[PDB]
Amino acid sequence: PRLEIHHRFKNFLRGHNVFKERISDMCKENRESLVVNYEDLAAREHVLAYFLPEAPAELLQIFDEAALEVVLAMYPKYDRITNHIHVRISHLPLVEELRSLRQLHLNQLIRTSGVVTSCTGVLPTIYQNYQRIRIQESPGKVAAGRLPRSKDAILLADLVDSCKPGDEIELTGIYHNNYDGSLNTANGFPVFATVILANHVAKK
Amino acid sequence: VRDEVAEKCQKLFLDFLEEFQSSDGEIKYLQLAEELIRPERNTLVVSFVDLEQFNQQLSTTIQEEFYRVYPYLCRALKTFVKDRKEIPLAKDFYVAFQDLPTRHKIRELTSSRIGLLTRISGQVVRTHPVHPELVSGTFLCLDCQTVIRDVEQQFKYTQPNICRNPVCANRRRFLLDTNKSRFVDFQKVRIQETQAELPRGSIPRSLEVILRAEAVESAQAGDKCDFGVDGYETEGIRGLRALGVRDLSYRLVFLACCNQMTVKEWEKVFEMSQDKNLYHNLCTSLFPTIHGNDEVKRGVLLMLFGGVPKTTGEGTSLRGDINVCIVGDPSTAKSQFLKHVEEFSPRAVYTSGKASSAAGLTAAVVRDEESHEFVIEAGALMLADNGVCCIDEFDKMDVRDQVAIHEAMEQQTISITKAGVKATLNARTSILAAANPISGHYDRSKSLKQNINLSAPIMSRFDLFFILVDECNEVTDYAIARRIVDLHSRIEESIDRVYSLDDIRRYLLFARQFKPKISKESEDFIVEQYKHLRQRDGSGVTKSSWRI
Amino acid sequence: LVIWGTDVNVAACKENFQRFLQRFIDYMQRLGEINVIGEPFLNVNCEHIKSFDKNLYRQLISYPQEVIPTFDMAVNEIFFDRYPDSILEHQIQVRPFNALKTKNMRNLNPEDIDQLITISGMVIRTSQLIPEMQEAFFQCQVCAHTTRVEMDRGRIAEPSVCGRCHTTHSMALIHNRSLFSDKQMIKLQESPEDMPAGQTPHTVILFAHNDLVDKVQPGDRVNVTGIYRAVPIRVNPRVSNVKSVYKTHIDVIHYFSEKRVELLKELSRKPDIYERLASALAPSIYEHEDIKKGILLQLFDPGTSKSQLLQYVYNLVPRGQYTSGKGSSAVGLTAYVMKDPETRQLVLQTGALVLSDNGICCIDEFDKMNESTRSVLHEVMEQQTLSIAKAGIICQLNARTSVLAAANHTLLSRFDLIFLLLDPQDEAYDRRLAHHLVALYLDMAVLKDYIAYAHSTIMPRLSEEASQALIEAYVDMRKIGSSAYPRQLESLIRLAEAHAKVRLSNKVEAIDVEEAKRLHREALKQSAT
């Protein structure tokens, strides 16, 4: 929880041939997002991907703080198209599935996977800034066929609607314990309650 | 006191606390240690056996000092990793003891025993969902100061009220550094006092004790328990009131974590095991006041007795329990007796049959949405787990049990479903059954179908059926209630037994520990006769019901 | 030296009582039974001792809250000197039984506080478990010392003496041995059974503790001693303005006729009281005497003499409760399950049937009962108790009672019995009925004890005198048109139960069974088509 890396990372956004090649990749498209892999950060600097359990939430703020800058810097064309970036980072190895879950592993940016048990694709500004999707994982086996604690995740306004009911896909996010339903102000996972913020998705 | 007790324990602990037996010291601790870090469970046990040798005062003063010895021994504990930088990354632990010489009833878990050491025996009841409320942390006043690492913790809502500037909560405070919090883990569940122990006039006791993280999802409702200040601002200052303090005072406060006679009774059991006529030697002792129906009791006798196949085809472990019916006239026609008879046994649950609002076995959490009527308990069925269920009036099962038994029989479970909630349970117990038919005995010429007046897919499932047809047989009936008056003949009579209605309960205790298995031969007479059974039944013989 | 607050001298009668415990002798068998066995907790009576000592005595009720301690001391002064090498940690606190003639707490004074008392009441309900705080300790601030407060002996169980530092109980209480206190509310009901009616009696704010906790059950009958307490009612806990009434709550500290009989004996000697009392019973009406009969036994067209009779039963009897369907469901009997909304917590809410255990139920409108109710009575009658598996108290409810009703469902089978008020279609009988009214235009209290002493004393035995006859009987009762091999026998005995519950004879013959034939016969006949 120190403060230099913000400015550095804003400069680290300026392993970087991929960035130079990815910044050109996205683009005139105007997609309001930015994607990096756990290899991409460490390929440049391994200090960065080390933040992902420790300050991913701020790292997202950092990445958002920097992604606004270099991109509007690189392309002021975006000044008239939404003037904002909401990042969409890539794989982040490891993966805690549906019953690999730990209070240990929370408040952390992780990759995992899960399958729609329910979705709110067309409905939700807090709620309107995201939506909900209810989730579990497994296939059929006798032991795996046992009922798991379903994942109930939120999609923060950019990964939204890319997940569809029946999608056995790969959910990356930040995995918080902000289950403020503790005194009637949130939802979260069951027993090992984790408020998971969301960062990446696989395909239908 | 708070500090020395917080400290002096650790020394007496730590030297005790390097796993002692099988040679001594560091090796056995390391097994416990290496077993811990690697799955990242953070759990151990501390046998009360070695301690009372070492120091029973510790083994005692726990009960006398549990509630402030904890948060320091808790804190010193955590360098099992052999590295102090890897301890604050840890979230929590849960430990246990071994071989406390006591437990206590709930009524024995008293005000003068609240909070204390708990050997943990009883009845899981009326479960809940499971939440990690916050032990310690901050919401410290953004306008003036940041973290103070203590708030919520007890079952409570906010904490911190000592010595502002913002530090005390005579000031606003709500935002929580949610990244910084001991949201721990638990549900609240209403553990009953087991009626199976209880002296008839009882009225059980649904203790609202918790299953926190280590205790979690290991049980189901009906089942085992195997678990500096401010100011000198003193009492009496204007403004202070106890109603902010009492609601816990309104509560539980404790919690939990995860022989000649033998041989003589055996000898009589051995003699009984040597005893011929044993069914008759058994029967009337259990079925004293029924005439006829010697077959019907004969199974019900056996219906008591179990015996299981495991899974070896990788299916389910197969049925051992039994599901048989007695069918006929109106309770007076004593099927009531049998339900009542069985009661002379434990592991035994007893309905008002079915015409009974008693909505249990339609399970649901009792604090769904503000407080909720339907309870997490199919003690209608579940509560006899590894016992037996006894149901009159089974035809009045109209819906909620209706499909319910079907799978439950079949699967020994209760797939709960709410579409925001969903579970499955386990009920491994037998189903004693009896229900009246349409309006009477008409089955002499009418098909069981609709004479049973129930649904094929369960009557089919019933292991057997039996009958109690009523008849005015003066060749007998002169003698019949001749019994019953002689059964009404209380004043100078006592009902003759073959033997106790206890030893039997110890026989069947003695009986099911023995196991059985058929020879390479015995299958034949199964086959040749099951054949012959099907053979006559498959050839067009006069049928009672197409089952085979 | 004095306690002007209660006017007791320094021990003020003590040394009379120390010798009393040794001078009572004819205690002296009991004086060791407490120390040597280990059974504390004296259990006195309405203290008859007043033949011994009045200055000891008059005090007994008087301000004895400062005396019972001295007793529980003074006993122990002697008792610990009697057998100090026994289990002497069993301190003794007295528990009187059938205490002094309480003036029916309905009537007791505002004054009547420092007063040992007893109930003549009935239970409405118990606390179930809610005990309370015991002793204090705060933390102060010179390096915060944890400061005994009510842990400090000599201080009081006040309100606001414990206004801070809850863990300094609420954890420390475990860590410091004050494990919280102990007290048990109950709602009882004073009920003199022939109260003036309308005006109604006093329920109870019981609270007091001891591990006689729960040894009084809901619905219970009374043998119960206590002491008064009360507390001024704040206009608010937030304020000191005063509701000037003190909130009563009670320290539980509990544990001629022969001439009438001779008259009864004549009535017992009298041979046709079954007819004579029948001629006396429900006298208000002409024929249907046959109906009138079984009420005695059972004691043992709308309202067309009916509620009258049931009210005759109601009137005749304390033990019973009149109600009916169609406005008052099962709830007016039982299973009214509902909360104290002032506290928002379910209660075993019930009714008349809970008033009816070892009683007689006067239902009406039995035709009008639902299946959401009346499945109760499907279950009740086959039980005589009622499983209440509910939120706060899963239990069953012994309603070992009696019932009767009538209306204008395959389970008439159960019933005690009711009859067919049909039209004789005889103007003359109407005239006889009219004459019965035109003529219209003691025995009870005798009855009231006639029924009683048998309910007190008598126990029939149907043995080989006439146990055979039952066997001879249901043969005769089944066979005509050949059901009585069903519990008709158990009814028949329940009818033959009566005449020997009559007559003060504990033993039975064919007569005193045989009457019940005609009853069940005529009852079968009138109910037969």
Short mmCIF file of N, CA and C in Angstrom, two decimals, chain B residues 139-260:
data_model
loop_
_atom_site.label_atom_id
_atom_site.label_comp_id
_atom_site.label_asym_id
_atom_site.label_seq_id
_atom_site.Cartn_x
_atom_site.Cartn_y
_atom_site.Cartn_z
N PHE B 139 -14.22 0.79 10.76
CA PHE B 139 -14.83 1.71 9.82
C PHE B 139 -14.32 3.10 10.13
N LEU B 140 -13.14 3.32 10.73
CA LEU B 140 -12.78 4.66 11.33
C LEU B 140 -13.09 6.01 10.62
N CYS B 141 -13.68 6.99 11.32
CA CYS B 141 -14.14 8.25 10.72
C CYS B 141 -13.25 8.91 9.72
N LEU B 142 -13.63 8.76 8.44
CA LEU B 142 -12.94 9.33 7.30
C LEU B 142 -12.63 10.78 7.50
N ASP B 143 -13.57 11.58 8.01
CA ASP B 143 -13.24 12.94 8.29
C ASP B 143 -12.07 13.06 9.27
N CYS B 144 -11.95 12.21 10.29
CA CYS B 144 -10.80 12.39 11.12
C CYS B 144 -9.75 11.32 11.29
N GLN B 145 -10.03 10.02 11.22
CA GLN B 145 -8.94 9.08 11.43
C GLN B 145 -9.15 7.78 10.76
N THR B 146 -8.09 6.99 10.64
CA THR B 146 -8.11 5.71 9.96
C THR B 146 -7.78 4.61 10.95
N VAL B 147 -7.55 3.41 10.41
CA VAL B 147 -7.95 2.13 10.99
C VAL B 147 -7.82 2.03 12.50
N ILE B 148 -8.84 1.46 13.12
CA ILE B 148 -8.73 0.84 14.43
C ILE B 148 -9.36 -0.54 14.33
N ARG B 149 -8.61 -1.55 14.70
CA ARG B 149 -8.84 -2.90 14.21
C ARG B 149 -9.71 -3.73 15.14
N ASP B 150 -10.86 -3.15 15.55
CA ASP B 150 -11.82 -3.76 16.44
C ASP B 150 -13.26 -3.13 16.28
N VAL B 151 -14.24 -3.96 15.82
CA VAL B 151 -15.69 -3.63 15.62
C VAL B 151 -16.48 -4.89 15.15
N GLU B 152 -17.79 -5.03 15.50
CA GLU B 152 -18.72 -6.18 15.18
C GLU B 152 -18.33 -7.35 16.08
N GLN B 153 -17.58 -8.38 15.64
CA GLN B 153 -17.08 -9.44 16.79
C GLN B 153 -17.92 -10.11 17.60
N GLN B 154 -18.56 -9.43 18.52
CA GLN B 154 -19.62 -10.24 19.06
C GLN B 154 -20.77 -10.18 18.14
N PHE B 155 -21.77 -11.01 18.35
CA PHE B 155 -22.91 -11.06 17.45
C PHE B 155 -23.61 -9.82 16.93
N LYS B 156 -23.21 -8.80 17.66
CA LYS B 156 -23.35 -7.38 17.52
C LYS B 156 -23.32 -6.70 16.15
N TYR B 157 -23.72 -5.42 16.10
CA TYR B 157 -23.63 -4.56 14.90
C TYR B 157 -22.34 -3.69 15.11
N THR B 158 -22.23 -2.37 14.96
CA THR B 158 -20.89 -1.72 15.19
C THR B 158 -20.22 -1.86 16.59
N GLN B 159 -18.89 -1.69 16.64
CA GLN B 159 -18.16 -1.62 17.89
C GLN B 159 -17.65 -0.16 18.24
N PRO B 160 -16.33 0.06 18.47
CA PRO B 160 -15.54 1.21 18.97
C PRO B 160 -16.21 2.55 19.54
N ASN B 161 -16.25 2.73 20.88
CA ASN B 161 -16.70 3.81 21.77
C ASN B 161 -15.75 4.12 22.95
N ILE B 162 -14.46 4.33 22.68
CA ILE B 162 -13.52 4.82 23.68
C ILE B 162 -12.65 5.92 23.07
N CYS B 163 -12.70 7.11 23.67
CA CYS B 163 -11.69 8.17 23.52
C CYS B 163 -11.55 8.71 22.09
N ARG B 164 -12.59 9.42 21.63
CA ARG B 164 -12.47 10.33 20.48
C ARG B 164 -11.22 11.19 20.65
N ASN B 165 -10.64 11.70 19.56
CA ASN B 165 -11.29 12.55 18.56
C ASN B 165 -12.33 12.01 17.56
N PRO B 166 -12.01 11.10 16.63
CA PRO B 166 -13.07 10.25 16.06
C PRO B 166 -13.10 8.82 16.59
N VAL B 167 -12.15 8.43 17.43
CA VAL B 167 -11.93 7.01 17.72
C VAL B 167 -13.17 6.39 18.36
N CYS B 168 -13.74 7.05 19.37
CA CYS B 168 -15.04 6.64 19.87
C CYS B 168 -16.13 7.01 18.88
N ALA B 169 -17.25 6.30 18.95
CA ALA B 169 -18.34 6.48 18.01
C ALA B 169 -19.38 7.47 18.51
N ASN B 170 -18.96 8.46 19.30
CA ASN B 170 -19.76 9.69 19.47
C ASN B 170 -19.41 10.62 18.31
N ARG B 171 -19.65 10.10 17.12
CA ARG B 171 -19.25 10.66 15.85
C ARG B 171 -19.75 9.68 14.81
N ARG B 172 -19.97 10.18 13.60
CA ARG B 172 -20.34 9.28 12.52
C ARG B 172 -19.23 8.27 12.28
N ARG B 173 -19.65 7.10 11.69
CA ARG B 173 -18.76 6.03 11.06
C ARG B 173 -19.46 4.80 10.41
N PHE B 174 -19.25 4.58 9.12
CA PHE B 174 -19.86 3.43 8.45
C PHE B 174 -19.03 2.71 7.38
N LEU B 175 -18.38 3.42 6.46
CA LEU B 175 -17.62 2.76 5.41
C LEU B 175 -16.56 1.82 5.97
N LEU B 176 -16.51 0.59 5.50
CA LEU B 176 -15.57 -0.32 6.03
C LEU B 176 -14.48 -0.67 5.10
N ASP B 177 -13.20 -0.60 5.53
CA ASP B 177 -12.16 -1.11 4.64
C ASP B 177 -12.39 -2.60 4.47
N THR B 178 -13.22 -2.96 3.50
CA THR B 178 -13.67 -4.34 3.36
C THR B 178 -12.54 -5.26 3.00
N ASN B 179 -11.52 -4.73 2.37
CA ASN B 179 -10.26 -5.44 2.22
C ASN B 179 -9.64 -5.80 3.55
N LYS B 180 -10.09 -5.18 4.64
CA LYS B 180 -9.52 -5.35 5.96
C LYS B 180 -10.64 -5.75 6.91
N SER B 181 -10.81 -7.05 7.11
CA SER B 181 -11.93 -7.53 7.89
C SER B 181 -11.81 -9.03 8.13
N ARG B 182 -12.22 -9.40 9.32
CA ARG B 182 -12.37 -10.73 9.84
C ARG B 182 -13.81 -11.19 9.73
N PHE B 183 -14.45 -10.90 8.62
CA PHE B 183 -15.56 -11.74 8.25
C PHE B 183 -15.12 -13.18 8.38
N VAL B 184 -15.71 -13.90 9.33
CA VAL B 184 -15.21 -15.24 9.61
C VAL B 184 -15.94 -16.38 8.90
N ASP B 185 -17.00 -16.96 9.51
CA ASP B 185 -17.91 -17.93 8.89
C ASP B 185 -18.90 -18.50 9.90
N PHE B 186 -20.21 -18.55 9.63
CA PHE B 186 -21.11 -19.39 10.43
C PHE B 186 -22.57 -19.31 9.99
N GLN B 187 -23.33 -20.33 10.40
CA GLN B 187 -24.78 -20.26 10.53
C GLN B 187 -25.21 -20.46 11.98
N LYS B 188 -26.50 -20.22 12.22
CA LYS B 188 -27.13 -20.39 13.51
C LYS B 188 -28.11 -21.53 13.34
N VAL B 189 -28.09 -22.51 14.25
CA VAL B 189 -28.99 -23.65 14.15
C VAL B 189 -29.49 -24.06 15.53
N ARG B 190 -30.72 -24.59 15.56
CA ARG B 190 -31.57 -24.65 16.75
C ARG B 190 -31.56 -26.04 17.36
N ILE B 191 -30.40 -26.43 17.85
CA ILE B 191 -30.17 -27.81 18.23
C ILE B 191 -31.13 -28.20 19.33
N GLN B 192 -31.86 -29.28 19.10
CA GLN B 192 -32.86 -29.79 20.01
C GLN B 192 -32.23 -30.66 21.09
N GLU B 193 -32.89 -30.73 22.25
CA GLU B 193 -32.63 -31.79 23.19
C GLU B 193 -33.24 -33.09 22.70
N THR B 194 -32.42 -34.11 22.52
CA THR B 194 -32.88 -35.38 21.98
C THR B 194 -33.97 -36.01 22.83
N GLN B 195 -35.17 -36.09 22.26
CA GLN B 195 -36.29 -36.75 22.92
C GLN B 195 -36.01 -38.23 23.15
N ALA B 196 -35.14 -38.85 22.35
CA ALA B 196 -34.86 -40.27 22.49
C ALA B 196 -34.15 -40.58 23.80
N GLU B 197 -33.63 -39.57 24.49
CA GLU B 197 -33.07 -39.72 25.82
C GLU B 197 -34.07 -39.35 26.90
N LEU B 198 -35.17 -38.75 26.52
CA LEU B 198 -35.84 -37.92 27.48
C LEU B 198 -36.91 -38.66 28.25
N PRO B 199 -37.17 -38.17 29.46
CA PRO B 199 -38.16 -38.74 30.34
C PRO B 199 -39.44 -38.16 29.80
N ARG B 200 -40.36 -38.99 29.32
CA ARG B 200 -41.65 -38.63 28.72
C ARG B 200 -42.09 -37.19 28.83
N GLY B 201 -42.47 -36.72 30.01
CA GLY B 201 -42.89 -35.34 30.14
C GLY B 201 -41.63 -34.56 29.92
N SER B 202 -41.41 -34.03 28.73
CA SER B 202 -40.17 -33.35 28.52
C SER B 202 -40.25 -31.95 27.97
N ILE B 203 -40.78 -31.79 26.75
CA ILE B 203 -40.86 -30.53 25.96
C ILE B 203 -39.38 -30.14 25.58
N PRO B 204 -38.66 -30.69 24.39
CA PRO B 204 -37.26 -30.48 23.99
C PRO B 204 -36.87 -29.02 23.80
N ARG B 205 -35.58 -28.82 23.55
CA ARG B 205 -34.90 -27.54 23.76
C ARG B 205 -34.01 -27.23 22.56
N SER B 206 -34.45 -26.28 21.74
CA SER B 206 -33.87 -26.05 20.41
C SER B 206 -32.79 -24.99 20.51
N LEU B 207 -31.64 -25.41 20.98
CA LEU B 207 -30.56 -24.50 21.25
C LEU B 207 -30.01 -23.89 19.98
N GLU B 208 -29.97 -22.57 19.95
CA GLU B 208 -29.58 -21.82 18.77
C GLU B 208 -28.07 -21.65 18.79
N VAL B 209 -27.34 -22.74 18.68
CA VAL B 209 -25.88 -22.70 18.65
C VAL B 209 -25.42 -22.89 17.21
N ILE B 210 -24.20 -22.44 16.94
CA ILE B 210 -23.73 -22.14 15.59
C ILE B 210 -22.90 -23.29 15.07
N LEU B 211 -22.90 -23.43 13.75
CA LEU B 211 -21.90 -24.18 13.02
C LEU B 211 -21.05 -23.18 12.24
N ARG B 212 -19.98 -22.70 12.87
CA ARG B 212 -18.97 -21.91 12.20
C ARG B 212 -18.00 -22.80 11.43
N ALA B 213 -17.21 -22.15 10.58
CA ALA B 213 -16.60 -22.72 9.38
C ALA B 213 -16.20 -24.17 9.46
N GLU B 214 -15.54 -24.54 10.53
CA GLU B 214 -15.06 -25.91 10.62
C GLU B 214 -16.20 -26.86 10.95
N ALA B 215 -17.27 -26.35 11.53
CA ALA B 215 -18.40 -27.17 11.92
C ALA B 215 -19.41 -27.32 10.80
N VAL B 216 -19.06 -26.91 9.58
CA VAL B 216 -20.08 -26.51 8.64
C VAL B 216 -20.41 -27.66 7.70
N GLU B 217 -21.69 -27.73 7.32
CA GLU B 217 -22.22 -28.64 6.30
C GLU B 217 -21.84 -30.08 6.59
N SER B 218 -21.60 -30.37 7.86
CA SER B 218 -21.26 -31.69 8.33
C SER B 218 -22.45 -32.37 8.96
N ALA B 219 -23.60 -31.71 8.99
CA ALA B 219 -24.74 -32.25 9.71
C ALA B 219 -26.00 -31.67 9.11
N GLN B 220 -27.12 -32.24 9.54
CA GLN B 220 -28.42 -31.98 8.98
C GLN B 220 -29.47 -32.12 10.07
N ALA B 221 -30.53 -31.34 9.94
CA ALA B 221 -31.42 -31.12 11.07
C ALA B 221 -32.11 -32.41 11.50
N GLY B 222 -31.62 -32.93 12.61
CA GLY B 222 -32.16 -34.09 13.28
C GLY B 222 -31.11 -34.95 13.94
N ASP B 223 -29.87 -34.48 13.96
CA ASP B 223 -28.72 -35.35 13.92
C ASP B 223 -27.73 -34.99 15.01
N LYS B 224 -26.67 -35.75 15.03
CA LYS B 224 -25.63 -35.76 16.04
C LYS B 224 -25.12 -34.38 16.37
N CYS B 225 -24.61 -34.21 17.59
CA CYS B 225 -23.60 -33.21 17.86
C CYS B 225 -22.29 -33.93 18.10
N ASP B 226 -21.34 -33.64 17.25
CA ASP B 226 -19.99 -34.14 17.37
C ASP B 226 -19.14 -32.91 17.08
N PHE B 227 -19.05 -32.06 18.08
CA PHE B 227 -18.32 -30.82 17.98
C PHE B 227 -17.46 -30.66 19.22
N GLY B 228 -6.91 -0.84 28.37
CA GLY B 228 -7.28 0.52 28.06
C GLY B 228 -8.75 0.68 27.75
N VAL B 229 -9.39 1.58 28.48
CA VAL B 229 -10.73 2.03 28.21
C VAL B 229 -10.81 3.52 28.52
N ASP B 230 -12.02 4.05 28.42
CA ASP B 230 -12.26 5.47 28.47
C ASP B 230 -12.59 5.97 29.87
N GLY B 231 -11.93 7.05 30.25
CA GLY B 231 -12.53 8.06 31.08
C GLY B 231 -12.79 7.78 32.54
N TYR B 232 -12.82 6.51 32.94
CA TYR B 232 -13.41 6.10 34.19
C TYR B 232 -14.87 6.46 34.24
N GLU B 233 -15.52 6.50 33.08
CA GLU B 233 -16.94 6.78 33.05
C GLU B 233 -17.69 5.55 33.52
N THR B 234 -18.13 5.61 34.78
CA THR B 234 -18.57 4.43 35.50
C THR B 234 -20.07 4.26 35.34
N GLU B 235 -20.60 3.21 35.97
CA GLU B 235 -22.02 2.94 35.94
C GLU B 235 -22.79 4.11 36.54
N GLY B 236 -24.08 4.18 36.21
CA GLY B 236 -24.96 5.16 36.78
C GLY B 236 -24.93 6.53 36.13
N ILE B 237 -24.01 6.76 35.19
CA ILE B 237 -23.98 8.04 34.49
C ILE B 237 -25.26 8.20 33.69
N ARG B 238 -25.82 9.41 33.71
CA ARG B 238 -27.07 9.68 33.01
C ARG B 238 -26.94 9.40 31.52
N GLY B 239 -27.90 8.64 30.98
CA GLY B 239 -27.94 8.28 29.58
C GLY B 239 -27.70 6.81 29.30
N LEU B 240 -27.09 6.07 30.22
CA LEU B 240 -26.78 4.66 30.00
C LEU B 240 -27.98 3.79 30.34
N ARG B 241 -28.25 2.80 29.48
CA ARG B 241 -29.37 1.88 29.66
C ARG B 241 -28.96 0.49 29.20
N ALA B 242 -29.52 -0.54 29.85
CA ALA B 242 -29.15 -1.93 29.60
C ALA B 242 -29.85 -2.55 28.40
N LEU B 243 -30.83 -1.88 27.80
CA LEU B 243 -31.56 -2.48 26.70
C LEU B 243 -30.72 -2.59 25.43
N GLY B 244 -29.63 -1.82 25.35
CA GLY B 244 -28.65 -2.04 24.31
C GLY B 244 -27.69 -3.18 24.57
N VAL B 245 -27.81 -3.85 25.72
CA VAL B 245 -26.81 -4.80 26.19
C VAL B 245 -27.39 -6.20 26.32
N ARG B 246 -28.70 -6.30 26.54
CA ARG B 246 -29.55 -7.40 27.01
C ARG B 246 -29.82 -8.45 25.94
N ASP B 247 -29.85 -8.07 24.67
CA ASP B 247 -30.32 -9.00 23.65
C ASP B 247 -29.44 -10.23 23.58
N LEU B 248 -28.13 -10.07 23.73
CA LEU B 248 -27.32 -11.24 24.05
C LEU B 248 -27.66 -11.85 25.40
N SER B 249 -27.93 -11.02 26.41
CA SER B 249 -28.36 -11.58 27.67
C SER B 249 -29.62 -12.40 27.49
N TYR B 250 -30.39 -12.08 26.46
CA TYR B 250 -31.52 -12.86 26.01
C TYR B 250 -31.16 -14.17 25.30
N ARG B 251 -29.88 -14.47 25.17
CA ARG B 251 -29.42 -15.56 24.32
C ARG B 251 -28.62 -16.69 24.96
N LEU B 252 -28.47 -17.78 24.20
CA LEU B 252 -27.31 -18.65 24.35
C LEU B 252 -26.07 -17.81 24.48
N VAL B 253 -25.15 -18.28 25.28
CA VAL B 253 -23.79 -17.87 25.14
C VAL B 253 -22.98 -19.10 25.43
N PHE B 254 -22.59 -19.74 24.36
CA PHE B 254 -21.48 -20.64 24.20
C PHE B 254 -21.47 -20.94 22.73
N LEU B 255 -20.57 -21.82 22.34
CA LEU B 255 -20.50 -22.31 20.98
C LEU B 255 -19.56 -23.49 20.93
N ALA B 256 -19.41 -24.04 19.74
CA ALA B 256 -18.86 -25.35 19.54
C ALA B 256 -18.03 -25.31 18.27
N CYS B 257 -17.22 -26.33 18.09
CA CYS B 257 -16.24 -26.39 17.02
C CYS B 257 -16.05 -27.84 16.61
N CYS B 258 -15.65 -28.04 15.36
CA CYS B 258 -15.16 -29.34 14.90
C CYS B 258 -13.67 -29.27 14.58
N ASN B 259 -17.03 -56.86 32.46
CA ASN B 259 -18.43 -56.50 32.64
C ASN B 259 -19.31 -57.75 32.59
N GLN B 260 -19.67 -58.24 33.78
CA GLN B 260 -20.54 -59.41 33.87
C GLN B 260 -21.87 -59.18 33.18
#
